[PDB]
Coordinates of N, CA and C in Angstrom, one line a residue:
Chain A
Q1 N 95.3 7.8 -27.9 CA 95.1 9.1 -27.2 C 93.7 9.2 -26.7
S2 N 92.8 8.4 -27.1 CA 91.3 8.6 -26.8 C 90.9 7.8 -25.5
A3 N 91.7 7.0 -24.9 CA 91.3 6.2 -23.7 C 91.8 6.8 -22.4
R4 N 92.9 7.6 -22.4 CA 93.4 8.3 -21.2 C 92.3 9.1 -20.6
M5 N 91.5 9.9 -21.3 CA 90.5 10.7 -20.7 C 89.4 9.9 -20.1
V6 N 89.1 8.7 -20.6 CA 88.2 7.8 -20.0 C 88.8 7.4 -18.6
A7 N 90.0 7.0 -18.6 CA 90.7 6.7 -17.3 C 90.6 7.8 -16.3
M8 N 90.9 9.0 -16.7 CA 90.9 10.1 -15.7 C 89.5 10.4 -15.3
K9 N 88.5 10.4 -16.1 CA 87.1 10.7 -15.7 C 86.6 9.6 -14.7
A10 N 86.9 8.3 -15.0 CA 86.6 7.3 -14.0 C 87.3 7.5 -12.7
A11 N 88.6 7.9 -12.7 CA 89.3 8.2 -11.5 C 88.7 9.3 -10.7
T12 N 88.3 10.4 -11.4 CA 87.6 11.5 -10.7 C 86.3 11.1 -10.0
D13 N 85.5 10.3 -10.7 CA 84.2 9.9 -10.1 C 84.5 9.0 -8.9
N14 N 85.5 8.1 -9.0 CA 85.8 7.3 -7.8 C 86.3 8.2 -6.6
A15 N 87.1 9.2 -6.9 CA 87.5 10.1 -5.9 C 86.4 10.9 -5.2
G16 N 85.4 11.3 -6.0 CA 84.2 12.0 -5.5 C 83.5 11.1 -4.5
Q17 N 83.2 9.8 -4.9 CA 82.6 8.9 -4.1 C 83.3 8.7 -2.8
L18 N 84.7 8.6 -2.9 CA 85.5 8.4 -1.7 C 85.4 9.5 -0.7
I19 N 85.4 10.8 -1.2 CA 85.3 11.9 -0.3 C 83.9 12.0 0.3
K20 N 82.9 11.6 -0.4 CA 81.6 11.6 0.2 C 81.5 10.6 1.4
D21 N 82.0 9.4 1.2 CA 82.0 8.5 2.3 C 82.9 8.9 3.5
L22 N 84.0 9.5 3.2 CA 84.9 10.0 4.2 C 84.3 11.2 5.0
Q23 N 83.5 12.0 4.3 CA 82.8 13.1 5.0 C 81.8 12.6 5.9
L24 N 81.0 11.5 5.5 CA 80.1 10.9 6.4 C 80.7 10.4 7.7
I25 N 81.9 9.7 7.5 CA 82.6 9.1 8.7 C 83.1 10.2 9.6
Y26 N 83.6 11.3 8.9 CA 84.1 12.5 9.7 C 83.0 13.1 10.5
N27 N 81.8 13.3 10.0 CA 80.7 13.9 10.7 C 80.3 13.0 11.9
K28 N 80.3 11.7 11.7 CA 80.0 10.8 12.8 C 81.0 10.9 13.9
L29 N 82.3 10.9 13.6 CA 83.3 11.0 14.6 C 83.3 12.4 15.3
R30 N 83.0 13.4 14.6 CA 82.9 14.8 15.2 C 81.8 14.8 16.3
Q31 N 80.6 14.3 15.9 CA 79.5 14.3 16.9 C 79.9 13.4 18.1
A32 N 80.5 12.3 17.9 CA 80.9 11.4 19.0 C 81.9 12.1 19.9
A33 N 82.9 12.8 19.3 CA 83.9 13.5 20.1 C 83.2 14.7 20.9
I34 N 82.3 15.4 20.3 CA 81.7 16.5 21.1 C 80.9 15.9 22.3
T35 N 80.1 14.8 22.0 CA 79.4 14.2 23.1 C 80.3 13.7 24.2
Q36 N 81.4 13.1 23.9 CA 82.3 12.6 24.9 C 82.9 13.7 25.7
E37 N 83.3 14.8 25.1 CA 83.9 15.9 25.8 C 82.9 16.5 26.7
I38 N 81.6 16.7 26.3 CA 80.6 17.3 27.1 C 80.3 16.4 28.3
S39 N 80.2 15.1 28.1 CA 80.0 14.2 29.2 C 81.1 14.2 30.2
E40 N 82.4 14.3 29.7 CA 83.5 14.3 30.6 C 83.5 15.6 31.5
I41 N 83.2 16.7 30.8 CA 83.2 18.0 31.6 C 82.1 18.0 32.6
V42 N 80.9 17.5 32.3 CA 79.8 17.4 33.3 C 80.2 16.5 34.4
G43 N 80.7 15.3 34.1 CA 81.1 14.4 35.2 C 82.2 15.0 36.1
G44 N 83.2 15.7 35.5 CA 84.1 16.4 36.4 C 83.5 17.5 37.2
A45 N 82.5 18.2 36.7 CA 81.9 19.2 37.4 C 81.1 18.7 38.6
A46 N 80.4 17.6 38.4 CA 79.5 17.0 39.4 C 80.3 16.4 40.6
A47 N 81.5 15.9 40.3 CA 82.3 15.2 41.3 C 82.8 16.2 42.4
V48 N 82.8 17.5 42.2 CA 83.2 18.5 43.1 C 82.0 19.0 43.9
Chain B
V1 N 104.8 12.8 -65.4 CA 104.3 14.0 -66.1 C 103.5 13.6 -67.3
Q2 N 102.4 14.2 -67.6 CA 101.6 14.0 -68.8 C 100.8 15.3 -69.1
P3 N 100.4 15.5 -70.3 CA 99.9 16.8 -70.7 C 98.7 17.3 -69.8
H4 N 97.9 16.4 -69.2 CA 96.8 16.9 -68.5 C 97.0 16.9 -67.0
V5 N 97.8 16.0 -66.4 CA 98.1 16.0 -65.0 C 99.6 15.9 -64.7
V6 N 100.0 16.5 -63.6 CA 101.4 16.5 -63.2 C 101.5 16.2 -61.8
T7 N 102.2 15.1 -61.4 CA 102.4 14.7 -60.0 C 103.7 14.1 -59.8
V8 N 104.4 14.6 -58.8 CA 105.7 14.0 -58.5 C 105.7 13.6 -57.0
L9 N 106.1 12.3 -56.8 CA 106.0 11.7 -55.4 C 107.4 11.7 -54.9
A10 N 107.6 12.0 -53.6 CA 108.9 12.1 -52.9 C 108.8 11.5 -51.6
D11 N 109.8 10.7 -51.2 CA 109.8 10.1 -49.9 C 110.1 11.2 -48.8
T12 N 111.1 12.1 -49.0 CA 111.3 13.2 -48.2 C 111.4 14.4 -49.1
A13 N 110.7 15.5 -48.8 CA 110.6 16.7 -49.6 C 110.4 17.9 -48.7
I14 N 111.0 19.0 -49.1 CA 110.8 20.3 -48.4 C 111.4 21.4 -49.3
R15 N 111.0 22.6 -49.1 CA 111.4 23.7 -50.0 C 112.9 23.9 -49.8
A16 N 113.6 23.8 -51.0 CA 115.1 23.8 -51.0 C 115.7 25.2 -51.1
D17 N 115.5 26.0 -50.0 CA 116.2 27.3 -50.0 C 117.7 27.2 -50.0
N18 N 118.2 26.0 -49.7 CA 119.6 25.8 -49.8 C 119.9 24.3 -50.3
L19 N 121.1 24.0 -50.6 CA 121.5 22.7 -51.0 C 121.4 21.7 -49.9
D20 N 121.2 22.1 -48.6 CA 121.1 21.2 -47.5 C 119.9 21.7 -46.6
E21 N 119.3 20.7 -45.9 CA 118.1 20.9 -45.1 C 118.3 20.4 -43.7
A22 N 119.5 19.9 -43.3 CA 119.7 19.4 -42.0 C 119.6 20.5 -40.9
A23 N 120.1 21.7 -41.2 CA 120.1 22.8 -40.3 C 118.6 23.3 -40.1
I24 N 117.7 22.9 -40.9 CA 116.3 23.3 -40.7 C 115.6 22.1 -40.0
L25 N 115.9 20.9 -40.4 CA 115.2 19.7 -39.8 C 115.6 19.5 -38.4
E26 N 116.8 20.0 -38.0 CA 117.3 19.8 -36.6 C 116.4 20.6 -35.6
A27 N 115.8 21.7 -36.1 CA 114.9 22.5 -35.2 C 113.6 21.7 -34.9
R28 N 113.1 21.0 -36.0 CA 112.0 20.1 -35.7 C 112.3 18.9 -34.9
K29 N 113.5 18.4 -35.0 CA 114.0 17.3 -34.2 C 114.1 17.8 -32.7
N30 N 114.6 18.9 -32.5 CA 114.7 19.5 -31.1 C 113.3 19.7 -30.5
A31 N 112.4 20.2 -31.3 CA 111.0 20.4 -30.9 C 110.4 19.1 -30.5
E32 N 110.5 18.1 -31.3 CA 109.9 16.8 -31.1 C 110.5 16.1 -29.8
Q33 N 111.9 16.2 -29.7 CA 112.5 15.6 -28.5 C 112.1 16.3 -27.3
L34 N 112.0 17.6 -27.3 CA 111.6 18.4 -26.1 C 110.2 18.1 -25.8
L35 N 109.3 18.0 -26.7 CA 107.9 17.7 -26.4 C 107.7 16.3 -25.8
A36 N 108.5 15.3 -26.4 CA 108.4 14.0 -25.8 C 108.9 14.0 -24.4
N37 N 110.0 14.6 -24.1 CA 110.6 14.6 -22.8 C 109.6 15.3 -21.8
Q38 N 109.1 16.5 -22.2 CA 108.2 17.2 -21.3 C 106.9 16.4 -21.1
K39 N 106.4 15.7 -22.1 CA 105.2 14.9 -22.0 C 105.4 13.7 -21.0
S40 N 106.6 13.1 -21.1 CA 106.9 12.0 -20.2 C 107.0 12.5 -18.8
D41 N 107.6 13.6 -18.6 CA 107.7 14.2 -17.2 C 106.4 14.6 -16.7
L42 N 105.5 15.2 -17.5 CA 104.2 15.6 -17.0 C 103.4 14.3 -16.7
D43 N 103.4 13.3 -17.5 CA 102.6 12.1 -17.2 C 103.1 11.5 -15.9
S44 N 104.4 11.3 -15.8 CA 105.0 10.7 -14.5 C 104.6 11.5 -13.3
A45 N 104.8 12.8 -13.3 CA 104.6 13.6 -12.1 C 103.1 13.7 -11.8
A46 N 102.2 13.8 -12.8 CA 100.8 13.9 -12.6 C 100.2 12.6 -12.1
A47 N 100.6 11.4 -12.6 CA 100.0 10.2 -12.2 C 100.7 9.4 -11.1
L48 N 102.0 9.1 -11.3 CA 102.6 8.1 -10.4 C 102.7 8.5 -9.0
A49 N 103.2 9.8 -8.8 CA 103.3 10.3 -7.4 C 101.9 10.6 -6.8
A50 N 101.0 11.3 -7.6 CA 99.8 11.8 -7.0 C 98.8 10.7 -6.6
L51 N 98.6 9.7 -7.5 CA 97.7 8.7 -7.2 C 98.1 7.8 -6.0
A52 N 99.4 7.5 -6.0 CA 100.0 6.7 -4.9 C 99.9 7.5 -3.6
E53 N 100.1 8.8 -3.6 CA 100.0 9.6 -2.4 C 98.6 9.6 -1.9
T54 N 97.6 9.7 -2.8 CA 96.2 9.7 -2.4 C 95.9 8.3 -1.8
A55 N 96.3 7.2 -2.4 CA 96.0 5.9 -2.0 C 96.9 5.4 -0.8
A56 N 97.8 6.3 -0.3 CA 98.7 5.9 0.7 C 98.0 5.4 2.0
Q57 N 97.2 6.2 2.5 CA 96.6 6.0 3.9 C 95.1 6.3 3.8
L58 N 94.3 5.2 3.9 CA 92.8 5.4 3.9 C 92.2 4.4 4.9
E59 N 92.8 3.3 5.4 CA 92.1 2.3 6.1 C 92.2 2.6 7.6
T60 N 93.2 3.3 8.1 CA 93.3 3.6 9.5 C 92.1 4.5 10.0
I61 N 91.4 5.1 9.1 CA 90.2 5.9 9.4 C 88.9 5.1 9.2
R62 N 88.9 4.3 8.2 CA 87.7 3.4 8.0 C 87.6 2.4 9.2
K63 N 88.7 1.9 9.7 CA 88.6 0.9 10.8 C 88.2 1.5 12.1
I64 N 88.1 2.8 12.2 CA 87.7 3.5 13.5 C 86.4 4.3 13.4
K65 N 85.6 4.0 12.4 CA 84.3 4.7 12.3 C 83.4 4.6 13.5
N66 N 83.3 3.4 14.0 CA 82.3 3.1 15.1 C 82.9 3.4 16.5
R67 N 84.2 3.9 16.6 CA 84.8 4.1 17.8 C 84.1 5.2 18.6
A68 N 84.0 5.0 19.9 CA 83.4 6.0 20.9 C 84.4 6.6 21.8
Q69 N 85.7 6.1 21.8 CA 86.8 6.6 22.7 C 86.4 6.5 24.1

């Protein structure tokens, strides 16, 4: 009965690291998307 | 038994309010069986489904980190 809790605490730490990395990737993608949309809008505006 | 100390050892022993104890021990049997079944259900539901569901899909996002669309 004394090893299950070790297993769960290790799993929780790994999940925290995972969500940290995923948040970094998400922020990068969000900035890229905003930049692309703004560039597309400006390009469409200039062509008229 | 001896004049200074008294000790009786029993393999199975309980207060004999009646000539039988099966009707009392069956309650403990039901409690143990129920606790075992609920514990198995809790372990299965908490671990097998949840961890697999979390690990189901993670690479389709990692592979697209540097994308610029």
